[PDB]
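notes to self, project folder thing:

trying the whole complex as one job this time. last attempt i did each chain seperately and stitching them together was a nightmare. eight parts in total, labels are on each line so i dont mix them up again. if this works i'll redo the older ones the same way
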Amino acid sequence: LPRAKPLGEILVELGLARPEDVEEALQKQRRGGGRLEDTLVQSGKLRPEALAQAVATQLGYPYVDPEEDPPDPGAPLLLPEDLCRRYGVFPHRLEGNRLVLLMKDPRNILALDDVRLALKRKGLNYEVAPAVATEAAITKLIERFY
Amino acid sequence: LPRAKPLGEILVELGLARPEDVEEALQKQRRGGGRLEDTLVQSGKLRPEALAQAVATQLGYPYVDPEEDPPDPGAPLLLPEDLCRRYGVFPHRLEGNRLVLLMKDPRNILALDDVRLALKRKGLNYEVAPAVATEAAITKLIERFY
Amino acid sequence: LPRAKPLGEILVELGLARPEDVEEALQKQRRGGGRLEDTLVQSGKLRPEALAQAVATQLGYPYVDPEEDPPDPGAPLLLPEDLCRRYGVFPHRLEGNRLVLLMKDPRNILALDDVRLALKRKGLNYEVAPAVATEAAITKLIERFY
Amino acid sequence: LPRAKPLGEILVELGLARPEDVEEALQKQRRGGGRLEDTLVQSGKLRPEALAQAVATQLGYPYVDPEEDPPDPGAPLLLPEDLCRRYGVFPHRLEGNRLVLLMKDPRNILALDDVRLALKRKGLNYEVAPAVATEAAITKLIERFY
Amino acid sequence: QKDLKLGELLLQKGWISREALEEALVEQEKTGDLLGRILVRKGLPEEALYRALAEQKGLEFLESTEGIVPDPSAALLLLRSDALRYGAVPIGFQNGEVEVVLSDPRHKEAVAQLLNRPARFYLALPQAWEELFRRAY
Amino acid sequence: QKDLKLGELLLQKGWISREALEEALVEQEKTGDLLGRILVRKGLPEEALYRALAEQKGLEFLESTEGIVPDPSAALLLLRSDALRYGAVPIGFQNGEVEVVLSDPRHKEAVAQLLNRPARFYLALPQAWEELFRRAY
Amino acid sequence: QKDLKLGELLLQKGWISREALEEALVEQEKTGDLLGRILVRKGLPEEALYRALAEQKGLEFLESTEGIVPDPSAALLLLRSDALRYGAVPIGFQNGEVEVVLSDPRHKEAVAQLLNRPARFYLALPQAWEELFRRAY
Amino acid sequence: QKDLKLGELLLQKGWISREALEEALVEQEKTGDLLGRILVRKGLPEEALYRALAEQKGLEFLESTEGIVPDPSAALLLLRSDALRYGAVPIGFQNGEVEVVLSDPRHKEAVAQLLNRPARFYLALPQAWEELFRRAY
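result (full assembly):
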């Protein structure tokens, strides 16, 4: 898990990407061994727009701009900067055991797994209360607090 | 300690349980490694609130709600955060060698003897008066006062 | 009385304990090896107040009440927690090298003197100017400084 | 040094001691070895004022009231409480290399030498001109600053 | 008046159909209601607008009627029909605090409503606004 | 008016008969004199009073006027009768520290006399405190 | 003013019959009286009320007068009937707040007692107040 | 009204005769001037007066004729001739602070002057004071 509707093809179905970009992402699978999900964004093939809607579509996520959304200052310590920037993620408001983790792709299960473990080893009980956002803005937000 | 009645059984006396729930949960802890005080609810039988009011009752002590009852700061410093967290307990009223210890499980002797030792290092030769609380409420109490 | 005479009997004089309690405590010290005051505490006869009221009076020492009385924060540099615990004492008000050696029982002059000498082992060159507080207040007072 | 007149005889010149008291103190310099200044203070051959005034007369010193005469923060940094109490002293205003040193006996070279090493190793160039005050205030000046 | 073009992002993100943008945008200049709010239900899932608001305006990203709790203490501050067009329900009250949750903080015709006291903007759906008003207005 | 109640601590430590408390409280309202000063005479054995009072206000439990010497300048501030119903002739008289050794810091009507400037309280036996008047006014 | 839903802890913590809440809630909603004192006697034990109000308003439940010791600073001036009918005494200080023990923190005429100084409010039963009546003055 | 007893300390120091003390005290009671500035001339040196008094009243010790500086900004409160009979005068002047020479810290009428700005009291030699008086004001 997570399951539901695979990110690769939905990035394309939304009219925001080509099946060719899912395939080039898949070429990273062929040249690295990861999943579609992962590579759709990690190899830079499917459009960020496609991911903004598609990641959100596959599992059920909101999308928010980290520069403005209340970036709960204690939450940055919940996920040490390198375990935060490497995966394109940033901790926003905490909700008890839960974290509003803002991420470039909350369906990128490899990056997400490294973060999830960090959010339990360094963070909360994860119980994510997640959102989607470009890595660039997220990274700027991460840097502001660590 | 004190030895206590079984938690599930005090819940039976209170109209909060069947003896069936007590023994089934008991059989669960016999394999699970947790306590009856945990398995009455972990086995899916008795309400955690019922368990919470009932453990101190199981010992002859009151239900004390952690979001209400004053966590006199000397008490959490008397018994350290790590040590409190370790047993699911949170310190309250102090007197002479006395400490009220608000526990999810007042029966938990690991607290009371490791607490004893902590209290003695601080200067109290123990005389803990266990009291019981909802685990989540003391979790929040633990999070809020050291 | 109180005056010179041992704690118990002087407790009778102030209505703090009765001739019967002090006699049984004397019977206890015959094997107990302590002072009337120690066997009165050991036997469960004394109120913290019983001790404070008659013993101070006994020797012309003040009875002080630590909730208000000079809980001198620099005086622990003369009689630190180590020593406070050793004799059930607290460093009320410094005077040069002197210390208001708050003690559960100044009747035990030799204990006041042992502290006196022990003050040198920890700080300044002593000179006990002893006192007693409610035994419970001496305990709370000591806790306030460690 | 300090030298000038002998303390004992000055105590007497002021009408504040008998020559008989000076001589017993001198006998103490034969019955222990302390010098006249030590022996007078050790033997009690000084009216309190005799000591203070005689030294102020013998050598030349100021009259101050340490309760208000500036207990320069550098003073507790400069000379430690144990030493200060042992020799009856405590720095007041530090004056560059110099010091107004509160002292029960501004002539006693041994006491001054023990003080000197501390006032030499810390803060000053010693250059000390000790001041006259009641012992009550000497006590309070030492007592309040550490 | 200004933002990162509230409601146009939605087309870029696949959040809205082209037609939703063209209609809502004509209605924007024609009526004074703004594209952000106007687009909802024009080919715009309401949530997608909140994704856009969370991004284009920066309002705290909150939830639907099954998430956000109604509270007449504040909801009574603004008429349900206009409020629904505006895009907000003012919620809750302390002497020093009111929350305002809004779908279109671009709204040239009425954007300045509600936040005229110790309050700030949060972000949530018209679905919630109508139900939360009916439940508390 | 805060204390641990004179008459109650006194009964608790064996310091009074219950009747001393009850009658002294009546006289304490009918004449207005301090309960404590009244209790000594109504059935309280001297020291017994002062020890309770010292517990009531957290005061030092003191020795006599051999050491606790009054101030005649301060004594003449009050009519000695004011000072007597009050329960003390003052010791010292600082702007934030009159030294007072009252026979009953609990008694709300006579305790209110004398302190034109607040007192710091300490307390010993009535022999001392009545001597305190003999030594000052 | 916010709370943690008066009436809900009573049900959720097993303190009441739902009937206490619904009848009481309706009376608050229809008569304007306050849910706290309205709830008791409707299927709600007095103890049960106060524990819910304590948690809900960030306040604290009080035990009998062995615990709720009155504060003479006010209690000796306070009529015994004030201790009873507001169910209240102002006590000591903490931070800047002075405690107000109350028969009902929702019942603002009683929370008013003390408020010359900031306060945390505390809660207790009719018998706590009758015993406080009997002991305070 | 207090110090660590003028007259008596001066007698103890061997600075005055018993007669100087007593006659000076008669003059004190007769004129209102206090004993210290009176002991002098009756047998006490002013140096001796000042040295003992510095110890007696919380004073910082002052300097000789080669030390203390005159300044009308501060001194304009006590005329050189008042300063002379008093034995006291203000020292220097900062916009927010004055240092002051006392004579007798007990001379109620006179010690009430000198402080012509926020200020601190000090005390030492009459030689210094006289030259200071005559230049300061």
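what i see at first glance: Chain G is about 45% helix and 10% strand.
need to look closer tmrw
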